[PDB]
Structure 1
Amino acid sequence: SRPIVISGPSGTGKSTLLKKLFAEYPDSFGFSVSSTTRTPRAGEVNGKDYNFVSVDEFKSMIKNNEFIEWAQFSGNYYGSTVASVKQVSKSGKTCILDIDMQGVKSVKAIPELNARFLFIAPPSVEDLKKRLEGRGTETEESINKRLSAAQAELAYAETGAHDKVIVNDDLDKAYKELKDFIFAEK
């Protein structure tokens, strides 16, 4: 069917929502596997979480027009390829794209994808901050940066860019809303 673009700040539980969806409907949805130049992280699997590629290969991909969209984040490259999206869609599954607000804006200007847009918001920026500080892995400076980005995305969502906004203040309720949205059909 029409692909679904899901976006939202990291720390909102969005990865969990997708995990539940792929378990319950593994034959209905396919995940767009992004290409990235960043270093893999524990548990990540090449070809599943991401297509981890070199900088040379990423530059090559750009030059050969292999992307639907691409961006940099923290000095590394990320992008959605034409290939991954067609192998899934071709496959007969509904393609889900997990990309940031730059990606959303890019796909919006591709009328032919006819994508649907869903944004997963945090219950508040103050709660997002707590979660981020609660993990112990980032600096003061990186959290300020992520909070500014989250604020930007919340502001963009108020222009009505997304088909639906879901506030994830409970995993199972957001999961509900997610299903109601997706299976609305179009």
Structure 2
Amino acid sequence: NEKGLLIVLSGPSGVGKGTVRKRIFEDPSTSYKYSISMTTRQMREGEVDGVDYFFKTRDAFEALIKDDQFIEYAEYVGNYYGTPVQYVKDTMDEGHDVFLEIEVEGAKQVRKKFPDALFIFLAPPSLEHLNEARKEVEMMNLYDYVVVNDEVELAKNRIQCIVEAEHLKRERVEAKYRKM
């Protein structure tokens, strides 16, 4: 039906994707859901299970990998991080747009399962001020749109526009009227 969009935000480490995502979620003009990732790293002071992350053992995470229960996962410095599939599918089926915040290479995994998801790459402003740039540009080929994080407000506006445009796409709007 009118399933919600899957919106995938990534970019190089330290680019400020968390900060931009937080700005997007402060905007009252839209209402998004957020996929809380699973991790095998230890819970740190102040963190709460099912809020910051779902904290699991390495054996549990690997059992879930085996059962195809992640849209994407990766291992960083000995700890798994990944996106549980069921929350995403259920939330989209309820009509809600859902954001994933993932690391860059994970887009290939997501696209295999959700080829029509909206992939947004957040680029550092050092690209617009201009070797390391080659690596950053190489990362982009997995994504649909590129937004420079020059200022948090401007980046948020650009992303909101991209999402609004996605809701106006003909294939989506056409299907809605056809099915009616």
In the superposition, the TM-score normalised over structure 1's length comes to: 0.76
Which residue does the alignment assign to 2:135? 152
Change (3 A) 1:18 1:154: same
2:121 to 119, 122, 140: 119
Q: CA deviation at 1:90?
A: 2.8
Q: Does 1:169 align with 2:169?
A: no
2:20 to 17, 32, 50: 17
Q: CA deviation at 1:92?
A: 2.5
Change (3 A) 1:68 1:92: same
Which residue does the alignment assign to 2:58? 55
Q: Distance in 2 between matches of 1:2 and 1:37?
A: 28
Which residue does the alignment assign to 1:28? 31
Q: CA deviation at 1:181?
A: 0.9
Q: Distance in 2 between matches of 1:12 and 1:63?
A: 32
Q: CA deviation at 1:40?
A: 2.9
User: Alignment length, in residue pairs?
Assistant: 162
Q: Which amino acid aligns with 1:174?
A: A
**1:92-139 deviations in whole A, cap 9, x for unaligned?**
3101111112210111222x45211001011127x9xxxxxxxxxxxx
Alignment of 1:87-106 (within 5 A): 87-106=90-109
Tell me the SS of whatever aligns to 1:154: helix
Q: Distance in 2 between matches of 1:43 and 1:155?
A: 37
Q: Distance in 2 between matches of 1:26 and 1:40?
A: 34
Q: Which consecutive residues of structure 2, in runs of 5 or more, have no partner in the other structure?
A: 170-180
Does the 8 Å CA contact 1:2/1:113 hold for their aligned counterparts? no
Does the 8 Å CA contact 2:12/2:104 hold for their aligned counterparts? no
- The list of structure 1 runs, each at least 4 consecutive aligned residues, that deviate by more than 4 angstroms after superposition, is none
Change (3 A) 1:14 1:156: closer
1:181 to 147, 154, 162: 162
Q: Which amino acid aligns with 2:153?
A: D
**1:22-61 deviations in whole A, cap 9, x for unaligned?**
2224972111111110123454432122111111211111
Tell me the SS of whatever aligns to 1:33: coil
Q: Distance in 2 between matches of 1:22 and 1:7?
A: 16
Q: Distance in 2 between matches of 1:98 and 1:156?
A: 15
Q: Distance in 2 between matches of 1:115 and 1:70?
A: 17
Q: Which consecutive residues of structure 1, in runs of 5 or more, have no partner in the other structure?
A: 128-146
Tell me the SS of whatever aligns to 2:157: helix
Of stretches 51-60 and 82-91 in structure 1, the one that deviates more from structure 2 is 82-91
Alignment of 1:73-92 (within 5 A): 73-92=76-95
Does the 8 Å CA contact 1:27/1:93 hold for their aligned counterparts? no
